[PDB]
Tab-separated table of C-alpha atoms and ligand atoms in Angstrom:
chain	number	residue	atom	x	y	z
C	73	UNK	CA	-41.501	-24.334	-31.815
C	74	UNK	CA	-42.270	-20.932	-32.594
C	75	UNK	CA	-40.141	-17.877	-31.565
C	76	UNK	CA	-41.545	-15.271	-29.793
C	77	UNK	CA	-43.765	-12.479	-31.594
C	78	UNK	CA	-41.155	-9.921	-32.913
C	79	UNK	CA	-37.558	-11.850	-32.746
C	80	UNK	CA	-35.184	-10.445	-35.522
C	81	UNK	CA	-34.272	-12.765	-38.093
C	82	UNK	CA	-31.325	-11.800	-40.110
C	83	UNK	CA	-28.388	-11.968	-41.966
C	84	UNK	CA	-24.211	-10.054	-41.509
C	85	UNK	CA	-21.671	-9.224	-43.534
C	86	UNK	CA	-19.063	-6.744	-42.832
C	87	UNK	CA	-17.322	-3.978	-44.594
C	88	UNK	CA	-13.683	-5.046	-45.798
C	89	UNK	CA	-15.420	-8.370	-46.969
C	90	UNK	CA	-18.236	-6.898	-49.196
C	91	UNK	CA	-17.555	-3.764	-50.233
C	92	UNK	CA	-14.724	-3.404	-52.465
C	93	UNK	CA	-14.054	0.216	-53.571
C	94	UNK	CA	-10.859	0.155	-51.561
C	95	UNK	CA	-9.516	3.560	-52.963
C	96	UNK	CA	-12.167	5.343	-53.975
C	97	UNK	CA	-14.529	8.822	-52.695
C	98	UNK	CA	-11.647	9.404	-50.809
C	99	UNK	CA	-11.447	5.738	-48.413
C	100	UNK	CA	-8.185	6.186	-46.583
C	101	UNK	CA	-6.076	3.010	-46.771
C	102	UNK	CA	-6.457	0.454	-44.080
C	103	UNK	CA	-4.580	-2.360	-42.201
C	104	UNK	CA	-6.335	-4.758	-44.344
C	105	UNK	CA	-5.341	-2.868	-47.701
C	106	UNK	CA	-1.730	-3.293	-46.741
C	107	UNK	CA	-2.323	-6.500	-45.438
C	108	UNK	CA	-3.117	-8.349	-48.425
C	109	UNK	CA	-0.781	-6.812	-50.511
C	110	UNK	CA	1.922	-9.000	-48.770
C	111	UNK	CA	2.884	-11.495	-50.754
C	112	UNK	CA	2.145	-15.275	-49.079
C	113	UNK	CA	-0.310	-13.908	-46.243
C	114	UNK	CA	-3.366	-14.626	-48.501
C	115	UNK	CA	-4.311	-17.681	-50.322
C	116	UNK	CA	-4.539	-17.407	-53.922
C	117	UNK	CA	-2.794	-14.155	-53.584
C	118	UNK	CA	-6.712	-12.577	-52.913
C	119	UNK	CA	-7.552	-9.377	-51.594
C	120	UNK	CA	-10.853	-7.144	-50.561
C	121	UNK	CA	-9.987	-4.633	-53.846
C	122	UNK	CA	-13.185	-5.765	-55.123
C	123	UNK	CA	-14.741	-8.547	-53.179
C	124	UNK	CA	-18.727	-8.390	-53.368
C	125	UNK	CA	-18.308	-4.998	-54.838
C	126	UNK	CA	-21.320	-3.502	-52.618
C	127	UNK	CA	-20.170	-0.208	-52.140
C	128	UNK	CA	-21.429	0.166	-55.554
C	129	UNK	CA	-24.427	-2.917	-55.540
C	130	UNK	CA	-26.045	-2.395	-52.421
C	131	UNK	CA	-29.374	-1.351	-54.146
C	132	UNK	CA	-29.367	-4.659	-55.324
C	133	UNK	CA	-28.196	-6.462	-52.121
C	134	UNK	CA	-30.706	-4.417	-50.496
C	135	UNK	CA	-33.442	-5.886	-52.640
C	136	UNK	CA	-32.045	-9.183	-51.912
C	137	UNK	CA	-32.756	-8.811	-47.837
C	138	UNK	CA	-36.299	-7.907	-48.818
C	139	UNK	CA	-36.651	-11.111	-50.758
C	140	UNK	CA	-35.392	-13.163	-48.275
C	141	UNK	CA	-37.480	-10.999	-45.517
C	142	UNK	CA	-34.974	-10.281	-43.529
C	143	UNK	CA	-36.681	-8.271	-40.068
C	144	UNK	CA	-33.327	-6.959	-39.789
C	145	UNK	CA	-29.107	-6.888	-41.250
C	146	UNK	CA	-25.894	-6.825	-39.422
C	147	UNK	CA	-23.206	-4.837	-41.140
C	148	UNK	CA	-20.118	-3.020	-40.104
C	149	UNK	CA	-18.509	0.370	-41.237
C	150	UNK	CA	-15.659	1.028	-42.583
C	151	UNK	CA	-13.640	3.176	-40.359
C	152	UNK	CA	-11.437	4.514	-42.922
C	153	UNK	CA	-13.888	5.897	-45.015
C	154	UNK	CA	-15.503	7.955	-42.392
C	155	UNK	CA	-11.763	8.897	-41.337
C	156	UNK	CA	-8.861	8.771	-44.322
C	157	UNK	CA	-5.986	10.000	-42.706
C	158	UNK	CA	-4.349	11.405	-39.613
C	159	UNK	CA	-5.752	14.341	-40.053
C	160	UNK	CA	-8.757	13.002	-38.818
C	161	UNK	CA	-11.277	14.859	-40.807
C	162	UNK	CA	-14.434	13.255	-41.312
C	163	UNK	CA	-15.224	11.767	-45.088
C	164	UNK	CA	-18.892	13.136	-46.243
C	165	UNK	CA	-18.539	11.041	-49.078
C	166	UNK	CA	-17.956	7.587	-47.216
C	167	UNK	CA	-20.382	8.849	-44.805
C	168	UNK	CA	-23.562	9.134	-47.703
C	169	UNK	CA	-22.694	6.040	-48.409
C	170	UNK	CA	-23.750	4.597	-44.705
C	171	UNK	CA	-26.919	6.791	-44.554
C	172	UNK	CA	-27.498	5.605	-47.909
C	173	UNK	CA	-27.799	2.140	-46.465
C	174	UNK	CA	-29.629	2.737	-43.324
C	175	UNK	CA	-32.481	4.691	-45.340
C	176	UNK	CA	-32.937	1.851	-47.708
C	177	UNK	CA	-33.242	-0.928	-44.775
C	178	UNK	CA	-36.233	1.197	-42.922
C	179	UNK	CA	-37.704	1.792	-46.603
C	180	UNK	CA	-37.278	-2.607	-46.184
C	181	UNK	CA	-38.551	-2.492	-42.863
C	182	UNK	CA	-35.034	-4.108	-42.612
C	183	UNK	CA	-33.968	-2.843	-38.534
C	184	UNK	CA	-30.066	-2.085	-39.201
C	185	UNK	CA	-27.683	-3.400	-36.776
C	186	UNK	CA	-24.230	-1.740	-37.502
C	187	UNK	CA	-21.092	-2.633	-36.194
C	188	UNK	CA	-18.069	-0.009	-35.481
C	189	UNK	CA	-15.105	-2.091	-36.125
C	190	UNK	CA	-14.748	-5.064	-37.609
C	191	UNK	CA	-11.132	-5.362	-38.097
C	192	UNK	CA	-10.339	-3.068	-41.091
C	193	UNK	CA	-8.595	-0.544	-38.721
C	194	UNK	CA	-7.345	2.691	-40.824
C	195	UNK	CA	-4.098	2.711	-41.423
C	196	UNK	CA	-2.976	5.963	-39.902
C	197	UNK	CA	-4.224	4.568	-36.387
C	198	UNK	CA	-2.087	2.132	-36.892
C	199	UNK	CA	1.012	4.347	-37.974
C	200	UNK	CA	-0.151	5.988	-34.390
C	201	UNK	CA	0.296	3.187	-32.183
C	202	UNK	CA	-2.321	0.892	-33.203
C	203	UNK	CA	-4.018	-1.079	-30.778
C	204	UNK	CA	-0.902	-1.307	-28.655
C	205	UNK	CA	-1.593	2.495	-27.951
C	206	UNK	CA	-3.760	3.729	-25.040
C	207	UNK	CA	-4.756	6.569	-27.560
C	208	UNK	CA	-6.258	4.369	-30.301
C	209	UNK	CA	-9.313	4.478	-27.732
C	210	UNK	CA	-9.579	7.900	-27.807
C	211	UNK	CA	-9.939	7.597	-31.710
C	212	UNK	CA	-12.060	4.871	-31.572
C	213	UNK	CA	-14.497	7.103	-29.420
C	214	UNK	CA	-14.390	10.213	-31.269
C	215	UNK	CA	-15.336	7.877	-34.344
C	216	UNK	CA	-18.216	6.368	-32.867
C	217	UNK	CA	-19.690	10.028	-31.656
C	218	UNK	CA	-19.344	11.159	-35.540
C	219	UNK	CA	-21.031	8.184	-36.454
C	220	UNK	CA	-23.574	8.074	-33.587
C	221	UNK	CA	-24.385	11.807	-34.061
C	222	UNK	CA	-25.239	11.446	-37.671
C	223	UNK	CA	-27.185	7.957	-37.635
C	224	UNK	CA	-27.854	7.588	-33.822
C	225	UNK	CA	-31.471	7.485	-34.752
C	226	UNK	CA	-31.092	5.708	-37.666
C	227	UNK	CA	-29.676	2.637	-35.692
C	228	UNK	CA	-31.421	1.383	-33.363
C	229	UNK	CA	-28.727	-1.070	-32.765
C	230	UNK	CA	-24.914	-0.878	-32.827
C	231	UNK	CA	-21.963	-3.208	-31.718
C	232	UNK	CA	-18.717	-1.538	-30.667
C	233	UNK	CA	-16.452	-4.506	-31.988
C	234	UNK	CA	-16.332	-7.706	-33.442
C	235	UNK	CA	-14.680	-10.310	-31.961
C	236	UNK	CA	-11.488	-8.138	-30.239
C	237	UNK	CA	-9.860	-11.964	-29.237
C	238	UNK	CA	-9.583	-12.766	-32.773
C	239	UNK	CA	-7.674	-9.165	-33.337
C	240	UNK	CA	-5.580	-10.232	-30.387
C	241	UNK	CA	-4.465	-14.205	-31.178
C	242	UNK	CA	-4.310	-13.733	-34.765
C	243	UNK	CA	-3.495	-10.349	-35.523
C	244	UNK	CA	-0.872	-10.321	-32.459
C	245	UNK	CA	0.167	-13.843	-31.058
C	246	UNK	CA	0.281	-15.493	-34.572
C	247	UNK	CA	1.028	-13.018	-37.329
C	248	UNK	CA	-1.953	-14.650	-39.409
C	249	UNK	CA	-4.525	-11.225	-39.774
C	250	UNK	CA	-3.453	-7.959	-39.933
C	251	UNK	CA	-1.535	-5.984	-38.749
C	252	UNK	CA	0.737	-9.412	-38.300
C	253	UNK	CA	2.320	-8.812	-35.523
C	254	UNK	CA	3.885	-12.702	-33.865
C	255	UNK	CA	4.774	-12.033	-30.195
C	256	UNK	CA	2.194	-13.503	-27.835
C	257	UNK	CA	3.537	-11.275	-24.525
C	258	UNK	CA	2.058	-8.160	-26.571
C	259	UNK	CA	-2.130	-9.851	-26.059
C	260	UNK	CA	-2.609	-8.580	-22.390
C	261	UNK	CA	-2.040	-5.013	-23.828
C	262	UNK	CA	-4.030	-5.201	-27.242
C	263	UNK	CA	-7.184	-6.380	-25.112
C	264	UNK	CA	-7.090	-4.159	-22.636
C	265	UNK	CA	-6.972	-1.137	-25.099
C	266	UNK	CA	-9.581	-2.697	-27.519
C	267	UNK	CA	-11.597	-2.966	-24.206
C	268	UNK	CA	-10.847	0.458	-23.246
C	269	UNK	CA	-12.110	1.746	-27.084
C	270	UNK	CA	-15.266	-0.465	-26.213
C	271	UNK	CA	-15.931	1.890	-22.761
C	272	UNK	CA	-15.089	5.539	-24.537
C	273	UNK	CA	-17.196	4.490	-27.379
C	274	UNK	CA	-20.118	3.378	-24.743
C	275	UNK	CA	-19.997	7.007	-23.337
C	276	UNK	CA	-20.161	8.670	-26.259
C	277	UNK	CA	-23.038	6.404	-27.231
C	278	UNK	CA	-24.613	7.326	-23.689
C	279	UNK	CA	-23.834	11.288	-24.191
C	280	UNK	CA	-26.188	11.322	-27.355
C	281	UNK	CA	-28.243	9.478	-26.139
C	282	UNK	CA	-30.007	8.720	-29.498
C	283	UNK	CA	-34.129	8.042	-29.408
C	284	UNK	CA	-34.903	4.432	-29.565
C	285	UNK	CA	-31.407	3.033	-29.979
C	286	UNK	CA	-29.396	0.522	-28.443
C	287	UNK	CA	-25.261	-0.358	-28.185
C	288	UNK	CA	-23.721	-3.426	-27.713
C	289	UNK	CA	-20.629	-5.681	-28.220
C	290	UNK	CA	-20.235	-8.644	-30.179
C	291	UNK	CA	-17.585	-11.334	-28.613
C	292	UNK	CA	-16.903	-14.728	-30.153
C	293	UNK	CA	-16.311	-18.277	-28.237
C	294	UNK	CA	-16.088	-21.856	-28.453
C	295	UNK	CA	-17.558	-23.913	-26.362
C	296	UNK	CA	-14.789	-26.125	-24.352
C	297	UNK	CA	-15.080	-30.134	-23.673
C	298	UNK	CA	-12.658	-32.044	-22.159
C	299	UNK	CA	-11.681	-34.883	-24.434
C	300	UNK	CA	-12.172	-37.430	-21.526
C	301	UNK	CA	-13.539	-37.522	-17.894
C	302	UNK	CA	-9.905	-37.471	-16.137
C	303	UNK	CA	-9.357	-34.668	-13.696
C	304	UNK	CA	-6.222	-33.521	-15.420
C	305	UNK	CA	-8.201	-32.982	-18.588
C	306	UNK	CA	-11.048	-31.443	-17.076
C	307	UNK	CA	-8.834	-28.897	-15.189
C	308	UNK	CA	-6.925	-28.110	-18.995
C	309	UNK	CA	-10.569	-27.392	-20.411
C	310	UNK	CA	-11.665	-25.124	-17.085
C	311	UNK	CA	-8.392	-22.941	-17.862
C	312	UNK	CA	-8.798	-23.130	-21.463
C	313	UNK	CA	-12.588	-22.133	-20.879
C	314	UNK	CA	-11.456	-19.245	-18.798
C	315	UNK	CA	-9.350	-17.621	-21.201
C	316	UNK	CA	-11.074	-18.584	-24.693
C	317	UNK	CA	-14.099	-17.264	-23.292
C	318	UNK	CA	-14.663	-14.845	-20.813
C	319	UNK	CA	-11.200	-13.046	-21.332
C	320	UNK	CA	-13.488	-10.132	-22.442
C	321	UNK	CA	-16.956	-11.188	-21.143
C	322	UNK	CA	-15.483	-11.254	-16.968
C	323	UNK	CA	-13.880	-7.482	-17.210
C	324	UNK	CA	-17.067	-6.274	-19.358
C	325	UNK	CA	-19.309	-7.428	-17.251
C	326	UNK	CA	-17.800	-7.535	-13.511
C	327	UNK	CA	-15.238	-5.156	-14.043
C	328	UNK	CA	-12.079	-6.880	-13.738
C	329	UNK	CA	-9.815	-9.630	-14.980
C	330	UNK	CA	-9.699	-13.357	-14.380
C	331	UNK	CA	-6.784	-15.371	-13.159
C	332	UNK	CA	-6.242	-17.132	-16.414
C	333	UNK	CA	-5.988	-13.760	-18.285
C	334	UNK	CA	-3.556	-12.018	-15.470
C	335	UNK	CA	-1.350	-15.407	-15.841
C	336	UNK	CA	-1.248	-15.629	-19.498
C	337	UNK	CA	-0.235	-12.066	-19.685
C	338	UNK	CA	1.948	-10.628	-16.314
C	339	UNK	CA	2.264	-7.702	-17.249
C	340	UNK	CA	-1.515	-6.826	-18.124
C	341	UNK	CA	-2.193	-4.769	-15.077
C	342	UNK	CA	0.737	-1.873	-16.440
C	343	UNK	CA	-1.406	-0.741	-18.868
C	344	UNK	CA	-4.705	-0.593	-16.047
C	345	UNK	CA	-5.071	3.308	-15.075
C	346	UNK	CA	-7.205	4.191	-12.083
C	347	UNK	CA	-10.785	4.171	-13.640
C	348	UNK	CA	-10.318	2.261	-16.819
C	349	UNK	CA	-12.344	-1.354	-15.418
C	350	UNK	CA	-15.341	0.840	-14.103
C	351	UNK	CA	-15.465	2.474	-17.848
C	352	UNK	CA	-14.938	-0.903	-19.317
C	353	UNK	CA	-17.559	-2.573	-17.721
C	354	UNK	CA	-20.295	0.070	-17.915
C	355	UNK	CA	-23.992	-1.616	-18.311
C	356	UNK	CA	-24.353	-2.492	-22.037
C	357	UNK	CA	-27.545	-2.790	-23.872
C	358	UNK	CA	-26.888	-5.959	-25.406
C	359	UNK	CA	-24.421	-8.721	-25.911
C	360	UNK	CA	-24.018	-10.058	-29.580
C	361	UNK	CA	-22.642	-13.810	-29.865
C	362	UNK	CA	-20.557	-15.486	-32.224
C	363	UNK	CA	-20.361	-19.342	-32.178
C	364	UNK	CA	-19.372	-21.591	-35.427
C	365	UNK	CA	-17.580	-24.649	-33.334
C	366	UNK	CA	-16.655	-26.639	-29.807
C	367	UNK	CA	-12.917	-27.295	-28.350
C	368	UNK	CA	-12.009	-29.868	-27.019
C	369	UNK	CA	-9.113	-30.070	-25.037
C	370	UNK	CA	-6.913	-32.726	-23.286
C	371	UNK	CA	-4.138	-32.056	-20.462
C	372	UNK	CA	-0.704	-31.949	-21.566
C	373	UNK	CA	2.713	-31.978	-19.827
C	374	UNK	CA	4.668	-29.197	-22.162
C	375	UNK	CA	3.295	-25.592	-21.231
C	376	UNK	CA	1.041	-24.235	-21.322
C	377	UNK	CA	-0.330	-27.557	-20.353
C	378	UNK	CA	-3.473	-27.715	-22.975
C	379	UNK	CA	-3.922	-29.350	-25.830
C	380	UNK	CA	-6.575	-28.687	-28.377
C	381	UNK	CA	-7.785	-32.060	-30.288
C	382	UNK	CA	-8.424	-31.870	-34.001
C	383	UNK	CA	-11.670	-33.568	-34.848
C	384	UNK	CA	-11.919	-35.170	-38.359
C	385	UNK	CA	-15.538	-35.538	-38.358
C	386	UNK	CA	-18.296	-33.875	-38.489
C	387	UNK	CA	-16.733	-31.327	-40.147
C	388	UNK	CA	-17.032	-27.961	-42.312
C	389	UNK	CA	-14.698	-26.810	-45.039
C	390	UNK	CA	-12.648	-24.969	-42.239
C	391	UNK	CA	-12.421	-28.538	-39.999
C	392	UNK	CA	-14.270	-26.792	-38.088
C	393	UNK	CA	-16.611	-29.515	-36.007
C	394	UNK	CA	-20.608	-29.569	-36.556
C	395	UNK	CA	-21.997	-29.756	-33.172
C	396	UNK	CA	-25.332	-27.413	-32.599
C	397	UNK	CA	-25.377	-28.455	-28.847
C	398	UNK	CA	-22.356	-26.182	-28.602
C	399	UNK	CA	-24.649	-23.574	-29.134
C	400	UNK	CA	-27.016	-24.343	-26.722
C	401	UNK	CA	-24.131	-25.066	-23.305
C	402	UNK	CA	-22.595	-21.523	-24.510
C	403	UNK	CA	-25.769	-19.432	-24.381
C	404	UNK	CA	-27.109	-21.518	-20.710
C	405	UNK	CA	-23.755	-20.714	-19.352
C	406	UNK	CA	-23.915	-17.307	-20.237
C	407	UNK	CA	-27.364	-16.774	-18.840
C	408	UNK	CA	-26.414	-18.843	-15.504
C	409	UNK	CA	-23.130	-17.307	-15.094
C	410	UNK	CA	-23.956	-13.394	-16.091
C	411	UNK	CA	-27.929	-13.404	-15.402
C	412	UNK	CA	-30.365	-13.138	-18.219
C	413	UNK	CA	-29.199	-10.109	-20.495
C	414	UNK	CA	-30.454	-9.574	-23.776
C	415	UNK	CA	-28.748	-11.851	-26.798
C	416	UNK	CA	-28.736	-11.855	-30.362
C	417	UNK	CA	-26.395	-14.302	-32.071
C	418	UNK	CA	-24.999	-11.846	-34.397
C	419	UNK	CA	-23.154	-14.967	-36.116
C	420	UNK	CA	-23.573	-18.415	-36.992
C	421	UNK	CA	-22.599	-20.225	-40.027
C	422	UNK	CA	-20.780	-22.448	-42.273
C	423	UNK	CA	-18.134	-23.257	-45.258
C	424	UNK	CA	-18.938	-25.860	-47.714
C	425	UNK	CA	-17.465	-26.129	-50.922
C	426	UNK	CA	-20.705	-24.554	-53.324
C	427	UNK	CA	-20.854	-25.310	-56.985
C	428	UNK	CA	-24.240	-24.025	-59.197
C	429	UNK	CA	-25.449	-26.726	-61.193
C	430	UNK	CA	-26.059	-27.521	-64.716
C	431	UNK	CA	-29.423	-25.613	-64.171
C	432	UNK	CA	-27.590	-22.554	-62.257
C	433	UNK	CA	-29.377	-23.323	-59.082
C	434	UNK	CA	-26.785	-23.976	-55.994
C	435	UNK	CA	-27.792	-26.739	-53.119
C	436	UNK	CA	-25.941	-27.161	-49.955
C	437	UNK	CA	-28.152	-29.160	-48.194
C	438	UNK	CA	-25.145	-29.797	-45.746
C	439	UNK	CA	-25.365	-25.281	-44.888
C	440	UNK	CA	-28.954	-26.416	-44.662
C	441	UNK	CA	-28.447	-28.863	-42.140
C	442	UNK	CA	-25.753	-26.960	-40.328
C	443	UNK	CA	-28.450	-24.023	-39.621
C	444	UNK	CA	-31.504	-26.503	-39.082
C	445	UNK	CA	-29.633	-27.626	-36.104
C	446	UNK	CA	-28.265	-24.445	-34.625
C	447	UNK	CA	-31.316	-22.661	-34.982
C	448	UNK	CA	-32.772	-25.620	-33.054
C	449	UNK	CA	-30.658	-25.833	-30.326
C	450	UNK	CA	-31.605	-21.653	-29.890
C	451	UNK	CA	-35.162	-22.210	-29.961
C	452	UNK	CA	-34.120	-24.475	-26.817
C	453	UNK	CA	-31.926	-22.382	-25.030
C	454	UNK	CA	-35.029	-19.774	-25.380
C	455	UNK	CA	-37.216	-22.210	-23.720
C	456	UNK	CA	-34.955	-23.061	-21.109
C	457	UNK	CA	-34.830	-19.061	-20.121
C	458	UNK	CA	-32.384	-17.398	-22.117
C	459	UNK	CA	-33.170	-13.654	-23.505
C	460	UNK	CA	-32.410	-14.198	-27.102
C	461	UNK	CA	-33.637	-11.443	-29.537
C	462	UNK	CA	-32.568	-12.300	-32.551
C	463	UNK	CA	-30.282	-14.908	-35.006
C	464	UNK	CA	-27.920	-13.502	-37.949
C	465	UNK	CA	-26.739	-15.940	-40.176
C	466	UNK	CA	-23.379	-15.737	-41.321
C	467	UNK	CA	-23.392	-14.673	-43.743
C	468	UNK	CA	-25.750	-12.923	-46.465
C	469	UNK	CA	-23.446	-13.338	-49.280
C	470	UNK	CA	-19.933	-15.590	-50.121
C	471	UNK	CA	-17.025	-13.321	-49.783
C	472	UNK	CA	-13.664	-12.519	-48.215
C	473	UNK	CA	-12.850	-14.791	-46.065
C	474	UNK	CA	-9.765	-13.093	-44.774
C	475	UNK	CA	-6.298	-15.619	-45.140
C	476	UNK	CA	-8.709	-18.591	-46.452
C	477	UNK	CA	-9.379	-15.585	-49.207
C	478	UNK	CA	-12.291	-16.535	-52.079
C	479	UNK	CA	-11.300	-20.060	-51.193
C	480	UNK	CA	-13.977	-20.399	-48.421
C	481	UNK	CA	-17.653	-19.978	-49.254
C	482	UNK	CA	-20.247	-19.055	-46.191
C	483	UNK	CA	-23.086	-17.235	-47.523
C	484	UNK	CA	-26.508	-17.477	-47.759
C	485	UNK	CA	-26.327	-16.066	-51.077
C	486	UNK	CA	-24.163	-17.486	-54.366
C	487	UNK	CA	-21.409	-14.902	-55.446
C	488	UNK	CA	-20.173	-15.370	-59.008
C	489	UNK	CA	-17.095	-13.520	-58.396
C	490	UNK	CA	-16.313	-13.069	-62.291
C	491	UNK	CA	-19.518	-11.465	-62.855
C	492	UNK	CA	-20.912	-10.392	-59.376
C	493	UNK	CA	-23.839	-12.312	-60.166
C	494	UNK	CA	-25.816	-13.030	-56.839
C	495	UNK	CA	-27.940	-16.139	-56.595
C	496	UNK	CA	-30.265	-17.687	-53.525
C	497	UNK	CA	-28.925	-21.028	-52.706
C	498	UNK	CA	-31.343	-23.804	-51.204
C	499	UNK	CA	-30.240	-22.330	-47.578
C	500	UNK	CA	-31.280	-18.812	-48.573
C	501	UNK	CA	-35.007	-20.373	-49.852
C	502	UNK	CA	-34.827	-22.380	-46.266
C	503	UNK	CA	-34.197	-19.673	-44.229
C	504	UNK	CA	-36.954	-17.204	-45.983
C	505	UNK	CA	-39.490	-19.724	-44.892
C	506	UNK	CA	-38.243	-20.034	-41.240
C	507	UNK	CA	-38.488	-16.215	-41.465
C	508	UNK	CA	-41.757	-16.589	-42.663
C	509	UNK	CA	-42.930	-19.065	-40.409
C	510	UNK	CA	-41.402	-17.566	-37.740
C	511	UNK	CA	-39.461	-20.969	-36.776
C	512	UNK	CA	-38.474	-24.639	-37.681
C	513	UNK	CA	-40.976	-26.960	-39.673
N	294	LIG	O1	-14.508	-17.342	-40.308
N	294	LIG	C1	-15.905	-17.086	-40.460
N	294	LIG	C2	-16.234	-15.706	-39.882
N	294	LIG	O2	-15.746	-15.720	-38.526
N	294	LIG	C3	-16.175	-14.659	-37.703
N	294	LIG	O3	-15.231	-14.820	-36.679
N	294	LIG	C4	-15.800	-13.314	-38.325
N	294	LIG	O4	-16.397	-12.267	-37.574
N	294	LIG	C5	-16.189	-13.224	-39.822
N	294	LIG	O5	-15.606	-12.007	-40.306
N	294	LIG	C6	-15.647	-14.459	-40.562
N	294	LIG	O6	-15.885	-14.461	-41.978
């Protein structure tokens, strides 16, 4: 029932969707900026401009974790205000801002996690090259040592990135993120470089060497199920498993690439130079997990011979399918496959469609439900053997949620977008007392 003595509840958010402030204190433009000012790529026509408008609230958000009593708060930083333009000199303004932040969670006794990229890449990376260039991981590394060397012992946690297959499939194979790019034989490439950044950054970490501190990376998945117990079906959802995910957990952790990944993308091992595998899969401190939803999958004659089946219920506002024993098979198969590292699900969360009440209050018993069950189904993968350190829910507060825009409402926390007025839901209340009581009722 109870987690262990010292496990770090808490909640994320990142910086393109909660900060708004997109031009000012000199904040270089970035992928996302340009992004959304593309006419049909966002619904509602939406954008970050604004968004939760933290850059200038976090006092107030702050104050909000220490309600809630949050041990500890995932964010990420904002690349391009650290870094405007190409002439790569660092921002001291967008840099106050992020020691601002990290003094007021250890006035909190709030631990800060921070994440270095969460998708918001600056735009004058991307003018270089992008993520298609080798060289991007040479920026990405001498941004982490700036940010390392001034906050290293600040953070005692950090993440290198968020999520890098999203920034491949939908920012490269589909066109749907930013930068947009729609040509699927370009994915080998982007991962391996976003890999590569992951490495440089790690050994810049490891050069500092910062006094109590820890670096990580944060990779998302779905658990796979085959929709039936025919062998053609179960060999669809073993190669579908493969790539989804452990495209970046098998070279991160034993150095090299699996057959799925080389067969999706032929050309992948081009772009390999002699010690790049050794530097990507360098020990890490930490891996963060994402989880929201299951596939399941069916054989299918057409290439490339899967087929993922919709589910129409359980669902979330996304169709996204309820099923907390998802979380549970993902973090066992981690731990049997990989040994027992530490964990901390730096993600896990839901969209329902929130409304306040006559009264003002707003109840989502369903978010309440969807995070009774997950958190369950983590207490058990914890008793079965598996390192876990800490949960974030996603996420602390509604906000952008990227192509879905203001549309889509996961947090913890009511936005009034009108006013910026922030108010606890029943989930946020909930979640305060598992903090509190340290697990479930
Ligand atoms: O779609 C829900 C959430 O998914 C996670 O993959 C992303 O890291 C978040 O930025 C996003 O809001």
């Amino acid at each position: 029932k109870k987690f262990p003595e010292g496990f770090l509840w808490g909640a994320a958010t990142s910086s393109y969707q909660i900060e708004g402030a997109w031009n000012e204190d000199g904040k270089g433009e970035s992928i996302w900026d340009r992004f959304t000012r593309i006419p049909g790529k966002i619904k509602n026509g939406d954008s970050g401009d604004v968004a939760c408008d933290h850059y200038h609230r976090y006092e107030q958000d702050l104050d909000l974790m220490r309600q809630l009593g949050l041990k500890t708060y995932r964010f990420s930083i904002a690349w391009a205000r650290i870094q405007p333009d190409s002439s790569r000199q660092i921002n001291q303004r967008g840099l106050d801002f992020y020691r601002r932040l990290v003094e007021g969670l250890h006035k909190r006794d709030i631990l800060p996690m921070a994440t270095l990229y969460h998708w918001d890449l600056p735009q004058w990376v991307e003018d270089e090259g992008g993520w298609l260039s080798r060289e991007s991981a040479s920026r990405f590394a001498e941004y982490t040592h700036a940010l390392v060397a001034a906050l290293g012992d600040q953070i005692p946690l950090w993440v290198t990135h968020n999520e890098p297959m999203v920034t491949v499939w939908a920012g490269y194979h589909m066109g749907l993120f930013a930068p947009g790019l729609k040509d699927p034989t370009l994915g080998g490439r982007v991962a391996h470089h976003l890999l590569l950044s992951h490495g440089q950054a790690l050994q810049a970490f490891r050069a500092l060497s910062p006094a109590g501190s820890q670096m990580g990376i944060t990779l998302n998945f779905n658990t796979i199920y085959p929709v039936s117990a025919e062998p053609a079906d179960v060999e669809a959802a073993r190669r579908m498993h493969s790539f989804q995910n452990e495209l970046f957990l098998e070279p991160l952790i034993r150095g090299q690439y699996n057959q799925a990944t080389l067969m999706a993308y032929p050309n992948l091992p081009e772009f390999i130079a002699p010690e790049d595998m050794q530097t990507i899969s360098a020990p890490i401190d930490f891996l963060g997990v994402n989880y929201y939803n299951p596939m399941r999958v069916k054989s299918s004659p057409q290439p490339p011979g899967i087929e993922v089946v919709q589910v129409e219920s359980p669902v979330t506002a996304m169709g996204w399918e309820i099923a907390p024993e998802g979380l549970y098979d993902l973090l066992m198969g981690i731990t049997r496959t990989y040994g027992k590292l530490p964990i901390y699900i730096t993600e896990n969360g839901a969209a329902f469609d929130d409304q306040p009440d006559q009264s003002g209050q707003v109840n989502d018993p369903q978010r309440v439900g969807y995070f009774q069950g997950h958190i369950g189904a983590a207490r058990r993968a914890l008793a079965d053997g598996v390192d876990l350190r800490g949960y974030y829910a996603w996420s602390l507060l509604d906000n952008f949620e990227w192509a879905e825009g203001y549309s889509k409402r996961f947090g913890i926390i009511y936005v009034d977008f009108e006013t910026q007025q922030r108010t606890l839901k029943q989930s946020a209340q909930w979640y305060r007392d598992v903090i509190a009581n340290n697990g479930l009722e």
